[PDB]
Design a protein around this ligand. Sequence first.
Ligand SMILES: *[C@@H]1O[C@H](CO)[C@@H](O)[C@H](O)[C@H]1NC(C)=O
Ligand SMILES: *[C@@H]1O[C@H](CO)[C@@H](O)[C@H](O)[C@H]1NC(C)=O
Ligand SMILES: [Cu+2]
Ligand SMILES: [Cu+2]
Ligand SMILES: [Cu+2]
Ligand SMILES: [Cu+2]
Ligand SMILES: [Cu+2]
Ligand SMILES: [Cu+2]
Ligand SMILES: [Cu+2]
Ligand SMILES: [Cu+2]
Ligand SMILES: [Cu+2]
Ligand SMILES: [O-]
Ligand SMILES: [O-]
Lengths: 552, 552
Amino acid sequence: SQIRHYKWEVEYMFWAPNCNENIVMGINGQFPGPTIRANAGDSVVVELTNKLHTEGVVIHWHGILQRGTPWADGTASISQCAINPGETFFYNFTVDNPGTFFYHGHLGMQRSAGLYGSLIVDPPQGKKEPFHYDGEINLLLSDWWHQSIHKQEVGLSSKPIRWIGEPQTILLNGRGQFDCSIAAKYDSNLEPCKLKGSESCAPYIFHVSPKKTYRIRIASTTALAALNFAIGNHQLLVVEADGNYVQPFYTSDIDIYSGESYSVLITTDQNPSENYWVSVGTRARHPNTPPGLTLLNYLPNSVSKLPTSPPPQTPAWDDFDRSKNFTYRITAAMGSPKPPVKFNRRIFLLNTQNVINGYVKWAINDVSLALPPTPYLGAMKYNLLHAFDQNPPPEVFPEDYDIDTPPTNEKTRIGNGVYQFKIGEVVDVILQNANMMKENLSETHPWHLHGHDFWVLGYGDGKFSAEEESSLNLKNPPLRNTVVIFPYGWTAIRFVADNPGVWAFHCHIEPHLHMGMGVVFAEGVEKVGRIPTKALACGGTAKSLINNPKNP
Amino acid sequence: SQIRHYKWEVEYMFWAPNCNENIVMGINGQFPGPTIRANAGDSVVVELTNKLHTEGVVIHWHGILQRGTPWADGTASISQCAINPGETFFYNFTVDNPGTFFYHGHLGMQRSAGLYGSLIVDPPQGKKEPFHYDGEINLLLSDWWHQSIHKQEVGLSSKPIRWIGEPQTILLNGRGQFDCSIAAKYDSNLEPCKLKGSESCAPYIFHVSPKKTYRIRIASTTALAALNFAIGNHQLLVVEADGNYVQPFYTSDIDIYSGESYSVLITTDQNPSENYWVSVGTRARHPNTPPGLTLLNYLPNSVSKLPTSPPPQTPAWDDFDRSKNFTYRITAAMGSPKPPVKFNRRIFLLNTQNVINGYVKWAINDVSLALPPTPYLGAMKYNLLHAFDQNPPPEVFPEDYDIDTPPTNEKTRIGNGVYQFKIGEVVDVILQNANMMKENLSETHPWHLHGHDFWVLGYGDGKFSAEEESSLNLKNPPLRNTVVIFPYGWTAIRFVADNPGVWAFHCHIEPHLHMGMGVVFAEGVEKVGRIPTKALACGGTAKSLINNPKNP
Ligand SMILES: *[C@@H]1O[C@H](CO)[C@@H](O)[C@H](O)[C@H]1NC(C)=O
Ligand SMILES: *[C@@H]1O[C@H](CO)[C@@H](O)[C@H](O)[C@H]1NC(C)=O
Ligand SMILES: [Cu+2]
Ligand SMILES: [Cu+2]
Ligand SMILES: [Cu+2]
Ligand SMILES: [Cu+2]
Ligand SMILES: [Cu+2]
Ligand SMILES: [Cu+2]
Ligand SMILES: [Cu+2]
Ligand SMILES: [Cu+2]
Ligand SMILES: [Cu+2]
Ligand SMILES: [O-]
Ligand SMILES: [O-]
């Protein structure tokens, strides 16, 4: 086991992801950030210096469990106080298992500004992957707006709210094209991009040799878009989801929601004289963004040798039965950890879009989360009972609530209480979707849990009831860290509260988390060790711990 | 009989139709143009002064037959030379039958620039309409782009072609809204308009009293958009179409393609305590334009009092079965002229989208129309045989043509020949639609005939075959001047070549006309009287009528 050390600086910089200049948040002058790669069992040390002028910053390592290091999870106001301008903080954690992961900003909407990159973990040295491939291609998906993130944040907090709208561009490894298409030859209504291939927005080409097998790692840090990935003429064999192996299955395209990572295998068994299209299109929302496009370039064909076919047409955005068909087919690989069969706690979380005092907010069992200035982890370790609400938040919603109709907003409040578990509890969480404020509308929400993987026990339409208990999968359920709820449906997950610390469970669409769509879970904080002083130096924790008497 | 005399000047002016300023082509300082209202049998005298600086101008009176006066049709390079900067021209013509008509620009793409307005012809003096209503409402529909008409024209004449794209705003009597919605109340994601009611883009509100019946006259002069009209909680009785009366029927909404006009009656039955939504949305092309909206305000309710329901959602753009279900209902009112049972001429016109010398052109039986600098009517009256191509244009296409495949463009050319008819022939035209350059695309095209109304004999899917004869309606076919061809289908029309003159038959979508999609018919030209000198004053006709010898 090696210690992988990174020395990083976060600073804004002019950059043109889609060849239209804007500012991006870069790490050591790079957009996307540098890839961390390590082998399971290695320690990763990141010393991060904040070189933003007035903003604090944190980095969250999505999919890493932070077992023994809950302070290093990178969540402002939950695991730590944000890092101030000109300061250096050390994130020191172990990577326990192989998988496609990534990192992103977790303070305000900084991740939408560009703060993200890959974190890949290979098997322990000497050990190998359960499947063979010759090469690897790594792909990070994100979306991009030409409006400022600070204008987006202010607009989401105004009365009337100003929605951010559909992204202008889908970024594949940091690059995308706006107002022109690299596939304009198939339709004279499209404007041709004039690109020599050297530009910042020039496509990241996938170069493959004929008759080989490649693992394509795909992760999504989109702020809003749900995307569908497809390669012309090539089948994809799904072998990994969220750092865990799934029972393999072929598919023509995959759906991928913000927070998810997959590994797909392909084989370059097609006609070697041509190149093929890779298309990443928007689904689950009415599309207003052109697809992200690149080439699967079979070497030695020139990359300017365009495919004979158009890019694969994206599946219809609203065919949620097609979406469920893909999603329900995901099961744990043969030999994986099976869930505990009985639970100790089951919580029901109703997901609504509400209006709290003129403002459109999202709420979970009528509580829209407002995060405190004192980090929950420090505050619970030092038993600071005034830093946030001690009253247990609701574990059920009313059985007379009608999920087919808009909310009345009668009791909807803002809060910051924490659900508390005893170390060792088996917890089931039933997520229930419902109609939004507009009549006859409900959307998909990807939910992500920090510091744990969970088994996805099942999905269903309408309101969950006791009739549905027998449908829950306890044999084969996949272990994931992100899961979707479909329009008007429910999703059930189970996990064991065995990781000391304070962990959020929230929708991974960034405007939704900004509008309060999340809850905070805490377990065994009595067993948490020493927290770095920089993670404690703000709020109530700096107040109680800085000895500065008066008269003494 | 009465002479209506209009004194008119056309001049560009600054105007903001959707509250974004641009230049509009106004008549007598107003946009849209003044309404002409007369009784059938009157003579309209319009003396037009061209106050544009470097551009010529012409006005076409859509739907008026120009019986006796082919020179006043207002088609540059067909009926007349364009009127020069600083010159006045008189258009004198009789309005023969009552209806809802309109006028628009017919030189370059000048009508897209705002040159249009209403022409309503009432019944002969003393006579009454065949139906009762207590009031009438006049609506003219158009669409609006923010780019210049001349940057659009250069874009469509360029290699590679720069397509104009979907409109930014649908206009309802010259007003529409951009980037905000007057119906934002039903959806948080929309931006409210900050309108007082006084602005240039404030909606023309329809004021009605309860328990009455009104005739809403609706005409379309859009350059591109096919629209759908619907009023919340009000069924429509279709009673007139293209100046002629149809067999009445009820419908919840109508489709209207460019160049058509309708009259619909409604009764204000619904609850008098509220206002209802009028909604005009895009159909037939994938929409990227917000609906044109206004209120049916039931007096004395305040106009700030919104309806309790959202605007009616427009029917799906591509439900062509739904479209045909409406279109195929229209039949002539009993008492109307029945067609000649036998025809003397049948022509087959294949509509394709081609690439001629790198330019994307539209063509009819592989000839893309390019108009000559000499006006056809002048050319043919003076028998100037070198002024255009005297060879007959193609009257049939290859029966071995695959209408499901892109064209090859092998023999596609540009030309300017004319189909000539003997005065009195019963001419049959079958318009055949086909696949465009993009694989698997065929669009609707509104075709309009000048100087005539035709009977719409039938419509069919696929290629017309002679075995199709028994479906053609010779019993009740409607009299129209504009008709659509649906994707991959044919439409058959019949008319009588009884009006001395040169007349066009073209696709009424303004870009397609700019790209060559139309034909020119001429009949009985030796029966045309004296043409106005200004109409003759250009090209070959000026050259051969100006006596200017040399040495003298
Ligand atoms: C993190 O690792 C660095 C380098 O080994 C060490 O100096 C620092 O004290 C460590 N801090 C924590 C909280 O482990
Ligand atoms: C048109 O009518 C006006 C008014 O009667 C007359 O002065 C003008 O000469 C007429 N011109 C034509 C071409 O008929
Ligand atoms: Cu994340
Ligand atoms: Cu995470
Ligand atoms: Cu759409
Ligand atoms: Cu969400
Ligand atoms: Cu998070
Ligand atoms: Cu016309
Ligand atoms: Cu017209
Ligand atoms: Cu057309
Ligand atoms: Cu015309
Ligand atoms: O995470
Ligand atoms: O016309």
